[PDB]
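#struct-pred

JT: dropping the chains for the assembly here, can someone run the whole complex?
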Amino acid sequence: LPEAGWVGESATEPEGVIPTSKVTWANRTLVAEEVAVIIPVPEAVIDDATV
Amino acid sequence: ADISRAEVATLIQEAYSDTLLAAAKQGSTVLSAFQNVNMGTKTTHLPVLAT
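RK: done, full complex below.
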């Protein structure tokens, strides 16, 4: 975030000078990763089963 | 060679506001707590039981 200051009233002395300041930003990433499983079974068991 | 507020004398002129001026006012407590007896002379005598 930026910051403001209170300022005097002169041409001569540093209290009269408006301060400078900076806003900044940053980065966040979604990175896709894989989750998986392999489940093997006999084809005879698939044929014999009632479900 | 600047022109200062002091060098613009009375081309700049102060304002006035009454917004802080008004003040509320409080009566006697004993005039509201107790009976206000109307008097027509300096003294009234009240008898009381004493023994």
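JT: nice. DSSP finds one helix and no strands in chain A. The interface with chain B takes residues 9-12 of chain A (CB under 8 Å).
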